[PDB]
C-alpha cells in the first residue's frame, strides 16, 4: 500500500526565560523514527526506531545540523510574526510546521506537502501543484511575497518530490521487516446498564495498525451519528491503535442496533450486533 514520510516541528517562545523550546519529530507512516528536543541532553537528532539506528555518524551529524538550522529559522520567524501580527514581547507564541511526501505501493511519488501555523491557526501552506502558496490572511501574504520572489517553492519542491521520496524509499527498504505490516482491528461489543431501563452499547476496535478507521452506529439501517459518543483514536503504545463508539439504548431494544467497522486491512466491512439471549 501507500506510505508517507513526515516531519513535525513545534517552536514555543519562552518570554524572558531563555530561547524557544524546539521539538522536531520524524515519522514513516504512523511510526516515529527520529526526534530532536532543544531541552534534551544529547543536543542531537536521535534515533527512535531500530531500523534507523544502522545509519552512520555522517547521517546523524547532517540531521543534527539541518534540524538545528530549522530551529534557528523558527526562532527568527517567531520575532518576525510577532511584528506582522503587532503583538507584545511578553506573550508566549507557537510556530508549527508539517512537511513531507507520499509514495504508492510501487514507490512512485504521489503528493508532497508543507503547512505552517502560528498560534495554532493556518499561516501559510504550499499548494497541491508544489508551485504556488496559500496565505491564510494579509500578514501571511508578506511571507508569500518574499517566498515567491526568492523562488522558495522550487527549492522546497526539489526536496518534496526528490530528496524526500529518495530517503522514504530507503527507510521503507531498511525497515521492510516492520513498516510493510498492517494489523486488522480485533472487534467486539460491550453492554453496560445505566439504569433499570437503559444501557450503553459500546463497539470496540483494538490492535489495528493503519490508525485510520470508521466505527458507525445504525438503528434499523438508519444512522445514529447524533446519539453516538465517539472517542478519538488513541495509541495502544506498541504501534497499534484503539477506538470505541457508544450508543445509549432502551433496555430490550439492543437487537435493533448494529455497529459497522470500515478499515482497509479488512476484506469486508464488519457488522456487530448485540447477541441477545
Amino acid at each position: 500500500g501507500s506510505h508517507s514520510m513526515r516531519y513535525f516541528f513545534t517552536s514555543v517562545s519562552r518570554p524572558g526565560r531563555g530561547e524557544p523550546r524546539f521539538i522536531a519529530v520524524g515519522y514513516v507512516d504512523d511510526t516515529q523514527f527520529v526526534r530532536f528536543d532543544s531541552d534534551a541532553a544529547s543536543q542531537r537528532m536521535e534515533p527512535r526506531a531500530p531500523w534507523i539506528e544502522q545509519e552512520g555518524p555522517e547521517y546523524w551529524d547532517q540531521e543534527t545540523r539541518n534540524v538545528k538550522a530549522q530551529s534557528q529559522t523558527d526562532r527568527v520567524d517567531l520575532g518576525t510574526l510577532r511584528g506582522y501580527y503587532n503583538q507584545s514581547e511578553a506573550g508566549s507564541h507557537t510556530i508549527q510546521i508539517m512537511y513531507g511526501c507520499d509514495v504508492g505501493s510501487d514507490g512512485r511519488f504521489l503528493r508532497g506537502y508543507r503547512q505552517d501555523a502560528y498560534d495554532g491557526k493556518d499561516y501559510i501552506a504550499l499548494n497541491e501543484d508544489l508551485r504556488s502558496w496559500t496565505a491564510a490572511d494579509m500578514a501571511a501574504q508578506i511571507t508569500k511575497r518574499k517566498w515567491e520572489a526568492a523562488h522558495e517553492a522550487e527549492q522546497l519542491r526539489a526536496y518534496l518530490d526528490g530528496t524526500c521520496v529518495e530517503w522514504l524509499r530507503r527507510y521503507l527498504e531498511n525497515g521492510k521487516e516492520t513498516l510493510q505490516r498492517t494489523d486488522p482491528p480485533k472487534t467486539h461489543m460491550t453492554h453496560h446498564p445505566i439504569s433499570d431501563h437503559e444501557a450503553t452499547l459500546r463497539c470496540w476496535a483494538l490492535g489495528f495498525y493503519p490508525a485510520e478507521i470508521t466505527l458507525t452506529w445504525q438503528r434499523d439501517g438508519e444512522d445514529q451519528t447524533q446519539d453516538t459518543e465517539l472517542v478519538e483514536t488513541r495509541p495502544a503504545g506498541d504501534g497499534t491503535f484503539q477506538k470505541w463508539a457508544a450508543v445509549v439504548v432502551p433496555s430490550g431494544e439492543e437487537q435493533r442496533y448494529t455497529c459497522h467497522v470500515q478499515h482497509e486491512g479488512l476484506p469486508k466491512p464488519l457488522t456487530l450486533r448485540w447477541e441477545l439471549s
Partner: peptide
C-alpha cells in the same frame, strides 16, 4: 532526511 535549506518568514 530533514530539509537542508529553509527560507525565513
Amino acid at each position: 532526511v530533514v530539509r537542508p535549506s529553509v527560507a525565513s518568514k
